[PDB]
Amino acid sequence: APGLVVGLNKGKTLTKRQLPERPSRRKGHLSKRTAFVRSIVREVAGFAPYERRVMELIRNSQDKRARKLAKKRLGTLKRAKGKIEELTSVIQSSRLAH
């Protein structure tokens, strides 16, 4: 008969199961179209005044001052490190094109 016996136990035997990956855990993965959209917009929109100054320091090989300015503007190191890498590749792509 349908009935739940609450308390006591049911069984101490264990057998670990392998679980798949949930769709929500896929968030943050980069898409082929989102990467294209961002590359187009980044060129179209231009650069912020603080990104222009940071790009100037990287061009003059003053990376110590560039990283300091990015952190002072953005707030943390890993945000500054990511921005410097993004702007460095912009310079490299600009140099290859021009």
């Binding site: 179209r33 989102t34 959209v37 961002r38 187009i40 917009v41 980044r42 179209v44 929109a45 231009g46 650069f47 912020a48 005044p49 603080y50």
Partner: peptide, 17 residues
């Protein structure tokens, strides 16, 4: 709206400023 919403993140870029 993918382009519009990614352009809205660069609020101090040349076009947005």
């Amino acid at each position: 709206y993918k382009y519009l919403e990614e352009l809205a993140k660069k609020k101090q870029s040349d076009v947005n400023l």
